[PDB]
A paper describes a structure:
Consequently, CAF1 serves as a bridge between the NOT proteins and CCR4.
To characterize the catalytic core of the human CCR4-NOT complex, we coexpressed human CCR4a and CAF1a in E. coli, purified the complex (in the following named CCR4-CAF1) and determined a crystal structure at 3.3 Å resolution. All of the three protein domains, the CCR4 LRR domain (S29–S158), the CCR4 nuclease domain (I164–L545), and the CAF1 nuclease (Q10–L262), were clearly defined in the electron density, with the exception of some loops and disordered regions, which are not included in the model. Human CCR4 only contains a short N-terminal extension (M1–K28), which is followed by four and a half LRR repeats (LRR1 to LRR5) and two C-terminal α-helices that shield the hydrophobic residues of the last, incomplete repeat unit (LRR5). The two active sites remain almost 50 Å apart and in an orientation that precludes them to work simultaneously on the same RNA 3′-end. Difference electron density was observed in the active sites of both CCR4 and CAF1 and was interpreted by placing Mg2+ ions. However, due to the limited resolution of our crystal structure, we roughly positioned only a single Mg2+ ion to interpret the elongated difference electron density in CAF1.
Numbering used by the authors:
A (entry chain B): 10 to 262
B (entry chain A): 6 to 338, 350 to 398, 403 to 451, 459 to 545
The structure:
Amino acid sequence: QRICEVWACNLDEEMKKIRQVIRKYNYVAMDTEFPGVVARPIGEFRSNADYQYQLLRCNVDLLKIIQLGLTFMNEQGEYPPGTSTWQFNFKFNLTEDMYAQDSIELLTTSGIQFKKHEEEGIETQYFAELLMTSGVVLCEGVKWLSFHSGYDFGYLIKILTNSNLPEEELDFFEILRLFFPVIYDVKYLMKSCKNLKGGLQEVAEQLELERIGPQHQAGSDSLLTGMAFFKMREMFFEDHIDDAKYCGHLYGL
Amino acid sequence: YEPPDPRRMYTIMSSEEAANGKKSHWAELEISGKVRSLSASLWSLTHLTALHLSDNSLSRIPSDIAKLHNLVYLDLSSNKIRSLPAELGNMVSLRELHLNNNLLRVLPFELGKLFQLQTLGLKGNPLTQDILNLYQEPDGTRRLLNYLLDNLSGTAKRITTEQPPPRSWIMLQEPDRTRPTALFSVMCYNVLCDKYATRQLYGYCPSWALNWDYRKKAIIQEILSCNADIVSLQEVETEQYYSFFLVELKERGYNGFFSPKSRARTMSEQERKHVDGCAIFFKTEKFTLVQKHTVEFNQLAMANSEGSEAMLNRVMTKDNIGVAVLLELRKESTEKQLILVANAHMHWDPEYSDVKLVQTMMFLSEVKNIIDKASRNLKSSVGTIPLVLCADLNSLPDSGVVEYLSTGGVETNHKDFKELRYNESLTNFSCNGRITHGFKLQSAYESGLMPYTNYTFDFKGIIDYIFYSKPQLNTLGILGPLDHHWLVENNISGCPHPLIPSDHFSLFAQLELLLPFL
Ligand SMILES: [Mg+2]
Ligand SMILES: [Mg+2]
C-alpha cells in the first residue's frame, strides 16, 4: 500500500507529513493526467521545437489538471517508510469545465472517480500555497524526475504562478529553472541510450519493472517513473548523471 | 484573404529564418475534441485573428467571445448550438463567419451590424422560410445582413417614451415640542450589485438597463434626490464603493463606512473587486463618527458546549453580512448623546428560515454587546444608547425573522426554526419557551404603507426595513410607494426597469430623537 489517495478533505494533513519526508528523500518523480489536448496553433514558427512549446502553451492555459502523482525517494533509490507515493486528485467539473471527449473516456477506464472529484476535489489555488510553504519546489538540492514532462511541468507552473504560460519559449525556461533547479527528463536520457523507444509502459518491459497500482493512472505512473529512473541510471549511465548535459532538458523542447 | 484550407502548421525555412531570425507570429488557432464547453482563459487571447471551433458539441456561446476585437474569422460549423448571443454585434472586425449544420432557429438582429462580413455560411440550419429565401438570392449575404439590421430598428433600444411620476411623501406624526428634540432623515436601499444582476434572474430587463454603468448613474441620482442625513446601502461591490459611491457622495457632504460580506476567502484582486457588502453614510454637518464595527460572532460568548458547536456548524456562514457605526450629534445643527446605526443583508432564501432566523438573533445579540461597551466610558451618566436599524432581511412581515424584531422576541417552536425548534442552544442568545432581547423596536413603515419593497416578476414583498427604539425614537414621516396605477399604465412586470435601477425600492423615512435638559 505504497500509493496514497489525496482528496481535499485529507489534504492539509498529508502536507504536514511530506514536509518532514522531503528532508531525507529529496528526489521526486512526477506525472500528471490532464483532459487531453484540444488546441493546435497554425502559423510560421522559428523551429519545430518552437511550435512544440506554443502547442503546449495553449492547452496548459486552456485546461485544468485532473490528477497528480509524486513519489519521494532518496538518492540511493529507496522509498520512505509508510506511503511512498501521493496521488493528488483535483477539482474538475464535468459540466462547466472544458475537455476532449476521448480524453475523458480513457480516464474513466483508468478508474478516476470523476463525480467524487467534483464534490471532494482539491482547489488548485489553495494547493499551490501549501506546496509553496513545504519547500519541495525552489530549494537547492531537490531534484526532479519525469517522463514526457512538457505538459507535466507545464501545468505545475500555471498552478504555482496562477497565470497563463509566458509567450516567449525563453521566458518559460527561466521560470522553470527557479522552482526546480535540477530536472532530469527520463525520455531525454533514453535518447542517449541504445534500444530504448516507445511509451512508458513499453520501457518498463525492457527494464523488467513490476507495475503497482492501476495502469495509466497519474499516481501509478509517477511511481513507475521514479523506479525506472534509478535502474536506468545504474544501467546505462553508471550510477551518475552529468547535470550540465542532461539537467534542465525536457523532451520535445 | 482566404484562410488556407489545409489546417496544417507551416515553418519558416531554416537557412533564411535562422540568419534573419524573425519571430514566430501565429495568428490562427483550432479547437477539436468534441468538447462540451469553452474556457474563460480562451477569451484572453486578444491577438488571435482566426478561430476554428468546427465539429464540436458546443451548446451555447459566451458573450465574452467579443473580447477578440482583432478576430477577422470564425467557424462554428457542425456544432450543437441553439442560439447566438447579442454581444456578437460588437465584433465589427469580423469579416467571415460560418454557422453551418447547427440548431439555429433565427439569427440575432445585432448580427447585421457586422458591415465587414463578406462571406457567411448557413447551410444545415432550421431558419425561417423567408431567411432561406434571402440567402438564395444573388448577393443574398449582403441582403440578409441589411434585413437583420432593419429588424434591429424595431427593437429601438432606449426609446424611454414613458415618464416617471414622483413618489409621494406621507406624514405619520407632527414633531412634538414639549421637550427639545433632534430630527434626522434615514434611507435604506439595496442597489442590486452587478455580480448578481444577471438577465437569467431579471429576464424582463433589457441588457442595456442592467449594465452597471447605466444603473450606477440612475442610482446615485436617487440617493442625492432624497438627501437623507443617513444612507444605508446593501449589495455594493467593494470596487464601486471606494471609487464611485464614496466619491460622488462626498461632493454632496457624506462620509461613509464599508465592510465586505466575506473576508476569509483571500482570493485574487479580480475576485475581490466584485465582492459586495453593506455601507453606511451620513452628513458630517449633523453627525460625527465615534466608532466603527463589522459584526461577527465571538463564538465564545456562549457557554462552551457540544450542542452549541454541533448547532452553529449547521447555521454559521463565513460571511459576516453586517455593519454598524456609532455617531455623535454636533452641538450646532455638554450631554453628548450618541446613536448606533446598524445595517444588514440576509442573502439566504425563504426556505432556509432557520439560518436567517438564528443569524438574525446572532446579529442583534452582538449589537447589544457593542452598545454596552460604548455606553460605559462614553455615556455621560449611568445610560441608554438608541438604535436606528435598517436591513434587508429577505423576510416578509409575517415571518419569524421579522417577528423577533418587532415583537421583541420569538417562540422556541416558531415554524421558521424547522429542525432547530427547541434546541437548547437557541435559548442562550436571549438576554421558558421564548427567546427575548432587551431592545424594544418598531418598524418605520408599519401598517404596510409600501405594499412591497422588492418588485420582481416572481416575487412581490416587503423585505427591507427601518427600525428604531420606541422609548427614544419616533417617526414623523415616510416616503410612500410609487403610484401603483403608473406601474400598470406602463406594463411593468418586475424590476429593475429602464426607469427603476434596482430590484428593491428605497426607504426614506424621517425620525425624531428626544433631547433632555439643555
Ligand atoms: Mg501520464
Ligand atoms: Mg438582491
